[PDB]
Symmetry: C2
């Protein structure tokens, strides 16, 4: 306990993860059905497994990856990033946040974030010495308005360094239309701030019009974080991608510890394959997912849960009716105890998620039907 | 639209690697024989590749914890007990990481603060400083030239006292990149006797441990300082698991709790197929390093022979796989340019001594992680190129 008080002070801002806590609290319950995952459990295709094994027994320098990534976001999202100087690679999603947030942040700084939100941004922000200010989006059913945004920016004043936008959104499944994105950009272009655009769920958009990135309309302020593992099998190498104008990336690149500058074919190949040969594997997956989502929505509506229209995968965010209930953590622990199925408590996504549970439909239809069956059983009690 | 002045300020202190600059400078020369590799040239042993492939075929998603599969931690615990006589509880004292460098970096950022100083013995391996700078702390390099780049207890202490209470940590790297230097049990003990009276972290970078050539095996300072050492290892040097990302952190439970609190949210868990490979390596490949070590000793001896025939002063290489050698001609005082010229005239690349801290000038680093064919060829061309001098 001598050196243990000589670490970085910001670790004293780091609380225990709400999700990890919830899982360890229900770990000793045998055969829990899990609808809690943020990464789907893909059945890796035979050809990909064989490719991976060949790359093991191989024993180029990120160029082909960067190029494929560039072509990909041009075709998909009409964005132009030069593979030579505007595209960075990370070994995993969380390193992308580490790299970019450590590059931009300074101790006084505030970071705005629509809430409820993925629990992983605030820790990183805290570690580098800054603060997250949530934006309560409850009044528009979790859809951030340009007005909400501008009022929050104005509230935070001169210490505002960045806004983090996550769309399609975890945990709510919120997506934004072209005009919405355009209006948000119209707010953001008036302030000297970075925009962290976390678009990892982009491929899973159910709207009919496809995903629109804020970088289409706000290219100079946007650091675009993307990836592939939400919709492609990666054999565990869930590489992240950072896209940003040359002038910004020339700075971002100096967060060296958090960036990939060389990798074996074993490491890159699943990402390269997903960007090129698997570039359209999300379409059928979307068909199936729309089915799963519709089924859950119908069955939970029948139980009189209030459901946020999930236009982007793969979460349903449900308002637990009964007063049980204002303690979603407990409500879900009791569901876990009596019915042996797990969701994640809305509280795990901060204050503004209480009274909600998050169901992750990146799971088989059978696990889904069983889960709803049991929930229906669990609710007769109420 | 101008956000140039809106970044973290510490980014100011971070330039490109002098190594990278030298490689860039010679990128137009074709068919260059490179002896610059920072990783073993050997393929990963079959039994390990095999375990990887079985894991790929099993296709278990199998999210493991922040600390890695328990079987992996148990294997690492057992490994360092048997090999280095160290006792770490796999339940709470071992962290599994996507590579030794990320284990090290993550450890630095968890312990550092803007005020802080970190001490590092000459000649500095350039990978450390950027991490520290990114946090806003600073690296202070200890001039060890007067002992041929072997750190002495006196240098250490003098350095420690010179820095204030601003001193947060010492980084020891043994066997050392770029010198090949090692420390005996007694030397390690003497350094520990110095280090134990200061409230500071000891970052002990022991990735090269298995590549020790002295007939006494590697001794870790963690053996003498169990409570203040954070031990960084991995399987890249010992098991030729290169571009596999398996790093290991060993630390007292109290330190480990903090470390993992910080790592949870900054880095990604190791790939589980890799973690299975690592279990195979650590449990069934305990002596995988030996054949490689034999090959390395032969290459090393050939190089020492040839290089001493041309009057290079060679720092004693006891740990792999670098030879740091002093240039015996005037032009050698610009090692950068001397090696540029060597490259233009003979198409072979070494790394200039200047790329390793500020006390490295007049030296060159050969990496003998390289085939004997091209090592022999490199030495013959080097002879030819040295003819030109008197």
């Amino acid at each position: 306990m001598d050196l243990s008080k000589r670490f970085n002070k910001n670790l004293n801002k780091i609380e225990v993860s709400m999700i990890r806590q919830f899982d360890q609290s229900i770990s000793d319950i045998p055969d829990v059905l899990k609808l809690t995952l943020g990464e789907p459990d893909f059945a890796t295709p035979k050809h990909i497994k064989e490719a991976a094994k060949r790359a093991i027994d191989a024993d180029a320098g990120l160029l082909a990856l960067r190029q494929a990534a560039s072509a990909f976001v041009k075709e998909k999202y009409h964005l132009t990033y030069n593979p030579d100087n505007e595209i960075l690679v990370t070994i995993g999603a969380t390193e992308a946040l580490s790299a970019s947030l450590t590059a931009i942040l300074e101790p006084g700084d505030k970071v705005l974030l629509p809430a409820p939100a993925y629990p992983g941004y605030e820790p990183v922000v805290n570690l580098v010495g800054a603060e997250v200010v949530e934006i309560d989006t409850r009044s528009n059913d979790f859809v951030l308005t340009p007005e909400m945004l501008e009022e929050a920016i104005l509230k935070e004043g001169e210490a505002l360094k960045a806004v983090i936008l996550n769309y399609p959104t975890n945990p709510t499944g919120v997506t934004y239309s072209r005009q919405q994105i355009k209006n948000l950009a119209e707010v953001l272009k008036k302030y000297p701030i970075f925009v962290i655009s976390d678009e990892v769920y982009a491929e899973l958009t159910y709207t009919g019009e496809s995903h629109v990135s804020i970088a289409e309309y706000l290219p100079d302020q946007t650091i675009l974080i993307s990836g592939l593992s939400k919709s492609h099998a990666m054999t565990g190498w869930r590489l992240g991608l950072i896209f940003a104008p040359a002038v910004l990336t020339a700075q971002l690149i100096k967060s060296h510890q958090y960036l990939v500058t060389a990798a074996t074919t074993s490491v890159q190949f699943a990402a390269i394959e997903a960007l090129t040969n698997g570039k359209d594997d999300a379409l059928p997956m979307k068909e199936e997912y729309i089915k799963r989502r519709d089924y859950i929505i119908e069955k939970m509506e029948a139980m009189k849960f209030k459901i946020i229209k999930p236009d982007g995968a793969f979460y349903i965010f449900a308002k637990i009716p009964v007063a049980q209930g204002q303690d979603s953590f407990k409500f879900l622990q009791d569901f876990a105890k009596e019915k042996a199925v797990a969701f994640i408590p809305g509280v795990a996504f901060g204050k503004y998620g209480e009274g909600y549970l998050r169901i992750s439909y990146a799971a088989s239809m059978e696990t889904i039907k069983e889960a709803m069956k049991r929930l229906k059983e669990f609710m007769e009690q109420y």
